[model samples]
Target: MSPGVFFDSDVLYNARIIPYRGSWLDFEFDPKDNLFVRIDRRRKLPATIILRALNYTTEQILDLFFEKVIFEIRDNKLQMELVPERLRGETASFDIEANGKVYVEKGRRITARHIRQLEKDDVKLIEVPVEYIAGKVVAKDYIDESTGELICAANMELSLDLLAKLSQSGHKRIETLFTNDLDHGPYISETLRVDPTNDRLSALVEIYRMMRPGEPPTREAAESLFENLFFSEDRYDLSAVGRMKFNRSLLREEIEGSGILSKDDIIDVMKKLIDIRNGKGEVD
Candidate 1:
């Protein structure tokens, strides 16, 4: 997929000149906090996903499986050098850096305008490797010496360039600035992880959603589909559900890592007890 960034509504509202959340900070006018606010608007701090296409060698595979336009290789080892044919000032070489490294290679480049287009499209492409997982399929075994079991293999390959998530409070403040005032009274809204240790992905994402009070996802359906898709191996289960779970989980992890909600320290044991009394589970 083309490596593009998206400004979520929360971030967008904060970046503008409106006091959407009734906060003291003016994210739109404060020069000192503007940079942080912008970074958060782009979800650039903890991290975000920047998907790239690394390799797809076959015509059929390219046609059938992939749609994202990739910008560079993994580890941020790609750069784009632009030479404008008509304008001198228009031409410039831009180094695409990530995780503090420059990516460069000979004859692997696109132009400045092309880069902008890629950023706008938000493309995603894929090719599935079938050989590895094909063997896991089940079939009745019959003894036919002449016709041995047909071994069909498919090649699936895709590259995932995760844009790191950010956790700056500046982002949240900006979001608060642009969003509509919640009709609901003051409550914990959108609690995401800022700098997560390994294994905190699920928790981080769940908390992020919890912190933002809106419609709760249908828990039973979500859970049932999650299990059928990811955990179930039977033919009765749907693969689409599993893929959805996978995408959601990845998104959660990314948001948590992006450092926006790193310092929210409110502990609520009493809240948990109250929730239990209300027939809701604690730490939802």
Candidate 2:
């Protein structure tokens, strides 16, 4: 067996937070409009890990974690602001501390001490500032601040290690099963050539080699590979769009049926799942 790559705490954290969701193409799509889903527990856990690693206080986590941020349609801008009173419902309190300033509404305009105004319904989101919080991962770029000289050096190594691991693990299965199932199994070569470095492509090739062996992988098959794995789709529907919407609701149902609700119970199950994935947990 090849030596297993040990993941540092930061590597594990950022891997979870990097947006693993997918989007769909539609006829009514706006060129500048955008959409982002809530960061799932897997991703949020990593963000919390980074904050803990950086020694951020509980107050910092509260403000940065739950508070909403907005992205503007015009100028393609992102702004982090305090939750305003008008939107906080009856729970609003004057004693609420502003980690930063709240954008207050005035006559036909909103002003900010530090916040920026956004258009109505302009893709409201909750941003955890994963990169900002995890500054330790940044690549080196030299700048002579006193002389304003252009430093022709890479700012940072955007090491896509998660994708790299996904690619490596995915291809191993493809090589094993490709020839047995399909007569023309070598088409995996053709697909991987187009996007040699793409992790998603590598994963798709693995799935195709598993399901259709020698057959040419259709566009739908490739897209489904992306949808199911990254998005956690429980079942594949060819007609569906957007991320293969994972059936979290169904998973909740399973948990309910099992009658396990305590935090300890949940942690035990989670650790077991991790161990299983890491090859320490036994299978029946």
Candidate 3:
């Protein structure tokens, strides 16, 4: 019989596959929060078992497993992997031993004195599961084994690198700017400024003028411009620029939607924004 067949007996029978749920935030421009687990609900087995049954190696299984779980520091040590909450601790002071074998050559047996010395050096001794270090199968449970806390579902967020990659690949949604509310409404205004649509840009500009009322146009005027346009209506009682900050996500989306901006152009804009913000360069 094959090892795959032999491991079939080890599958967890009580595992539950949870589906994803979407959550809404008060902010409009932010990406919709989606949390879900993609599980074969019919197969009552751990993800590791499912992968192994498909002929996956220990390394490949680990790679896929890490993508789903979040690791955090606990008790002054970092959780090394998602499968088992094995901690990674400083090795400079504490002598590591496994299965009656010390890691360092000619290392003396760990004694109470040695442990006290480690404590004095501000080094901590942590109990890491041997199965985890050996990369054996870890039982799947949604709850964190160490702290007995339930883990949250996966969260998806956008980053500058992701935007750049999407733009470079010429994604169809690259032009789709979220503009339903004040936070992202400026994106609509900015996009229209570049494309100069008669309906959208003209209307936004009119609103901008009404809000600014008499303010003179200056360099780096898009924020103020967006501010004026967004708050022109009586429905909102909030500041426009305050709602949307000039960060990677906003700037990346802005330049990418510009159609004329390239990957390099996006990077340059980001650096310029950072420089101006840090007082290293004047905004122009």
Candidate 4:
């Protein structure tokens, strides 16, 4: 997915949205105190079975499953880089750093004309590792899984050590910012994490393991599916709901640790997944 620049009404503010939510279908731009907002799309076939079978009306179902959302918001004007892609100069102020001998020779102020000249000359922005998570910010809180302490703020910077520590963190909102809003109103409002931890493979691997009903999957199955799911990004994805739902399950199961999901819970969730695969609607 591509990150797009979003403008608040009347252009009071604007932001370049990092499409970390991973689906083109589900997104909403409401930026709150962090310039944040809510995103609740219609229920999909994935878990409709469990909710519907529980005798929930659409309203009740809505009440049951919130997207578990939190966001990157701040009133600070969003960077021009938030725009999806454009010819406009991506840098907000070019002169401060772009001052060069040529400009000094004439002592001319570098302006839009300078950026325009470059765009006319075709400068472009170049847009990863175990898909890196090292330099990103930890946008929300995390419960300490073992001691049950804290991770517990906004605008916290991340490191390899912290990322490893978070592997043990409990379920809580995790937001990341690419635009790290190095200046201005705190919330970077860009580059969200697709899963609870930045560990997509771990999340996907656990999901693969849990998906089997009775026939346990072998390691080979993981290698096979990894290519199908993550590599084939053009067609399939976990969706916002799938990413949110499965990541919650991953966090809960890990934090609770002592076999958190009883056999029944796994089976039920598996049944729901199976339905998604088969185009069936039965819950159990």
| Candidate of highest TM-score | 4
Q: Residue pairs in steric clash, candidate 3?
A: 20-36
Residue range 1-284, candidate 3, lDDT tens digits: 10000001111111111111211101011122111111222211111222232234443423332323222234433233222111122122333433454342223544455445444544333333322222212212233445555332111123444333333433322111121222112221222123221332343343334345576444346334443322233322212232222223234454212112122432243234323323453432
TM-score of each: 0.15, 0.19, 0.16, 0.23
Candidate 1 residue lDDT tens string, 1-284? 11111111231222221111211111221112111121113333221100001111222222222222222222322221221221122222333333343332223464555445434543221121222112221111122234453222112221221111101111110001011122211111111112131123332333334334464545454344323321334512213433233224224333222111111100122122223323343221
Point out where model 1 deviates above 4 Å: 1-284
Compared with the true structure, the alpha-carbon lDDT of candidate 3 equals: 0.27
Residue 159 of model 1, lDDT score: 20
Ranking by TM-score: 4, 2, 3, 1
Q: Which residue runs of candidate 2 sit more than 4 Å off their true CA positions?
A: 1-199, 225-284
lDDT of each: 0.23, 0.27, 0.27, 0.34
Screening candidate 4 with a backbone cut-off below 3 angstroms (N, C-alpha, C), the clashing residue pairs are: 16-82, 31-35, 31-36, 32-35, 32-36, 34-73, 34-74, 35-73, 35-74
RMSD (CA, Å), each prediction: 22.7, 21.9, 25.2, 19.4
In model 2, state the lDDT of residue 100: 52
